[PDB]
Amino acid sequence: MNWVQRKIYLYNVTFGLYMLDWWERYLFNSLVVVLMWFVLYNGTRYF
Amino acid sequence: MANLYVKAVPPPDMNRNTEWFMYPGVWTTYMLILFFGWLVVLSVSGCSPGMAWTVVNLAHFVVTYHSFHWMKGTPFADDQGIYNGLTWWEQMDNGQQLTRNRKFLTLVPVVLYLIASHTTDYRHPWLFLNTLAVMVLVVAKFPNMHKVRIFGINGD
Amino acid sequence: ILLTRKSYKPPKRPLTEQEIDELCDEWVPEPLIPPITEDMKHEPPVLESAAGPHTTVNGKDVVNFASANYLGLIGHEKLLESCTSALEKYGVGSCGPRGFYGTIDVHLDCETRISKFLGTPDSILYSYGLSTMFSTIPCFCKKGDVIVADEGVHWGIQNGLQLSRSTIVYFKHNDMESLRITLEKIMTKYKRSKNLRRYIVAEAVYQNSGQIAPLDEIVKLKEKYRFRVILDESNSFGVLGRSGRGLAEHHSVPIEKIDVVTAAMGHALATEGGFCTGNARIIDYQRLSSSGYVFSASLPPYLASAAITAIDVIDQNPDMLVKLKQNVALLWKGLSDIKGMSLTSNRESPIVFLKLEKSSGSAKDDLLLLEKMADRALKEDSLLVVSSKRSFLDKCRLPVGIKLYVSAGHSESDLLKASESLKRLASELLL
Amino acid sequence: GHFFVEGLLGVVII
Amino acid sequence: MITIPYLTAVSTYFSYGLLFAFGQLRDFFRRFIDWWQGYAPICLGHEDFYIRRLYHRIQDCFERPISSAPDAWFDVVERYSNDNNKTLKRTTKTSRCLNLGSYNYLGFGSFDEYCTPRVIESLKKFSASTCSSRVDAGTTSVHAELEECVTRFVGKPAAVVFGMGYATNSAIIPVLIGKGGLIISDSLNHSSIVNGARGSGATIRVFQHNTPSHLERVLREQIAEGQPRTHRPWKKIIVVVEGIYSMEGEICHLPEVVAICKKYKAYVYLDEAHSIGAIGKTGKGICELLGVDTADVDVMMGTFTKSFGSCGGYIAGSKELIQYLKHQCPAHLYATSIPTPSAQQIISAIKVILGEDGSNRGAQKLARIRENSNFFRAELQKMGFEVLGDNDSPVMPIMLYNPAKIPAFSRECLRQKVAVVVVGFPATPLLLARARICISASHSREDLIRALKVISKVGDLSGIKYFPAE
Ligand SMILES: CCCCCCCCCCCCC/C=C/[C@@H](O)[C@H](CO)NC(=O)CCCCCCCCCCCCCCCCCCCCCCC
């Protein structure tokens, strides 16, 4: 494992995504990516 | 990347269902889930902050009512169903009334409804609903509404 | 606002730290235990070299009628090889509960073997015989249910009935007429409620009376009121059916009609432990939510590797089953003419009960009366028998008496020596 | 019709 | 009593709430698909929610079947699913892992050359066990010789031995106390003790775990208030404590508890399940390590499963207590006697411990059980882990705090040939998930050295080094 691959693994176990099935995990990762893009694009220039 | 150690004390409470609500960190998570839902609503569908607070207050109604006031019993079979005629609200604190943790749970549906009204300019399309929701929540949590039902619906 | 309030007394002034000190000094506790007496301290025999039909006490050779090995498997040449080969390959201990690392492979093999023997999907082992009923009944019956017990069930069953905080109603000992009356009176008092669970708790061959339960009226009344049956066949597993299957093969009923079948391997298998049987859904649900299964060390593997051999011996040799009925009949043909006693058992159960007729007084007195009669049977003419030893925690109220656990290895001389010696002693003490 | 509620709920909270 | 990093107490509640939310959602789409013989269901809908929505997700970390003696190294059988993870079945393939999840402290759960030859001889002369109880025909000579070794070892005048360590608490507490009595138990008591208290009619209060300043304040109130409704006098008061509180690893504060029980004339019920061969310079338990007179405690319960490598239990006390129990205890009257080869193996183990076997390896075990625990526990603290318990205890739980780290810390360790035990939510409090490490006197130093580097490497990935290293 490399740095990014290790830091992803550390993230799966902290928020309980290591236990869920693939379809429960791909429905939450996408939904949290959307939130990180929305906050970035708006807050970066809406102020 | 770890600080702020807290030496938690075990309150006896002898009830798996409602003893986890005494350890340090519950209020902060309670609020951070609400503040997280608010941001996730207005990201999957771009809308107005007022409506989004309305959708948060409406979702927090069903989840909280169905969990604290509808369901009876415990999901642990160890106690041989000793609490079959009680809801999660009634089991808390061994029936002790007006404690620190009951007042916090009473105070949240009110302050969350104030925010969903003060940013939606009152009106009537949303005002009618939000008022009904907060009214149901506050009535269900009254001290006098202890082990009493309405026309015997889900009562025995 | 005011014209609706309630009159209340003003609050009281709390106790001081000085007053409490006094109250904590006047309080006095009772003794931990009641004072002992001299009738309370009789020691039991200490025996050697076996527990079979012919044991040994104080050097003299006595004849045994107090060990519950019906098939005569104590000291079989095929069990002492299995136990020996598994005792030097696993050790003598379990080292852990069964959910962490206490699941040896022999446990899985034993469960499969038992289920194949009875013809049932799945089975579950327990560590100790008396605790297979502490944990089976509280697992199924919660606080809102209704249990119809038998009023003649031993302490193992009636401790589980109390742990599971449900509603218990009894019926007369082996009285189907009193069973159906109770069933109807329950199916009327609970009319609007229909989600509750209802169970019937019985016993194949009762230990306090020796009477076989009739499993035809129970399986028929159960199909008419939507009930469930829990059968404790520890005294019938391996002795009672024509092939040894138990009560179901005795009354020729399918085993799928019986929801839960529990037994103890400490009677007719010459080992220790217990097991519970049923369909897959029931067994796999109490494998996680039981109490004596998840919190207790598993069976020592040398005990679970002898049950497999014992079941194989039983299966391969169905002649020792007819050899047992003959012995029970032979003891019944030489004891029917006793003076003060009275055979109050069934004609086929291998527990020859003997109720005392014309009770000599209070039950307390009758207990010592039976105790001395049991003592003099050994001291003089070398005979072990059993007498009803009730506790103060027991709630059974059946008549007391003297039992005789007949086996399939008894001779024809000792079997009648047990009859003459009882007739003489009963004659010269009671009448 | 906007500040009566926000003024009364503070009283109710206290 | 446990220091919890604040930032981890927040990502645990979030992790559990996400499981709850997905579970309710999935169970709501099963209730509408059940549309496709008249009796009530065996189990309601929602009494086993965490059994099928939390336990089944990690069901491969439990009930691992082994096919070897419970030794320092055993063989673990491999299991597959074959139907998309619903019913695991066992293969023929095996492994060879390091045993760190058993209980044999003194290394008696094996083939040692003073006990097994004697037990095999006491087998072929007595055939497993008698089929009668102890008051009729089940009191062999071996059963009378063993009740003397236990009295000599424990120290009290008389003792009774049963055949199950769980029935040694549910069939005795009803005898000693009944209705109108009181039982001030400790919070973290075994299930057997609470079930025994429920089997009687007594009332149960709970005082704060391992602190006497709270035990005094409960006795004062309960004696100043009497019965809960009709303020009669309390007929009795019994205080139940444990030697070593497993899953917390702490030795009890016995001298400060006995002193307060004397003052208020309450009784003391000790429970030396985990601490009867482990702690002490001779192995006599907590009453020897802490230097307390053994006659200040009224009843002392024990268990031979963990240290002596054989099933059983015992109760020791005044010679009239034993005479009362032998005459009114249901477990003694109705239950089959403890088997004979399972009693010879306790006799021949107490002989080794007391040094009456001729050799002197009864002190090597007692010294190597300590020089291994004091090493492992010291080394774990230096790497920054959070381990509980004192310096003189064979058990040391490592805290994890996150539900998702339970299958992560165990699956990795098993893959690297180390076997451990993990405990989840339905059994423990919500916030406190842990792993339990058991160190025996049969592990060598080469094994602990090799097992510490496997744990130190796994603990980096999961990030369970909550405290700072050096
Ligand atoms: C995605 C982040 C969260 C998403 C939704 C999570 C909501 C789930 C929290 C509901 C708490 C349930 C309280 C009592 C429920 C009882 O009925 C049942 C059966 O009796 N008890 C149980 O199942 C076991 C009792 C304890 C289990 C609780 C596990 C959840 C721990 C979280 C509690 C602290 C975090 C949240 C605090 C309360 C949440 C308030 C609801 C927020 C509404 C969100 C809508 C946007």
Numbering used by the authors:
A (entry chain C): 1 to 47
B (entry chain D): 1 to 156
C (entry chain A): 50 to 480
D (entry chain E): 36 to 49
E (entry chain B): 1 to 36, 42 to 475
Question: Paper's wording?
Answer:
The serine palmitoyltransferase (SPT) complex catalyzes the first and rate-limiting step in sphingolipid biosynthesis in all eukaryotes. ORM/ORMDL proteins are negative regulators of SPT that respond to cellular sphingolipid levels. We determined the cryo–electron microscopy structure of Arabidopsis SPT-ORM1 complex, composed of LCB1, LCB2a, SPTssa, and ORM1, in an inhibited state. The SPT-ORM1 complex is a ceramide sensor in the ER that controls cellular sphingolipid homeostasis.
Each protomer of the SPT-ORM1 dimer consists of LCB1, LCB2a, SPTssa, and ORM1 at a 1:1:1:1 ratio, and the transmembrane (TM) helix of LCB1 is swapped. In each protomer, a pyridoxal 5′-phosphate (PLP) cofactor was covalently linked to the ε-amino group of Lys311 in LCB2b as an internal aldimine. In addition, a robust lipid-like density that might belong to ceramide could be unambiguously resolved between ORM1 and LCB2a in the cytosolic membrane leaflet, which will be further discussed below. A ceramide molecule is sandwiched between ORM1 and LCB2a in the cytosolic membrane leaflet. The small polar head of C24-ceramide forms potential hydrogen bond interactions with the side-chain groups of Asn17 in ORM1 and Tyr55 in LCB2a and the main chain group of Ser67 in ORM1. The aliphatic sphingosine and acyl chains of ceramide are coordinated by numerous hydrophobic residues from both ORM1 and LCB2a. Unlike either of these, the N terminus of AtORM1 (residues 5 to 8) forms an antiparallel hybrid β sheet with the N terminus of LCB2a (residues 1 to 5) in the AtSPT-ORM1 complex structure. The potential acyl-CoA binding pocket in the AtSPT-ORM1 structure is partially shielded by Met14 and Asn15 from ORM1.
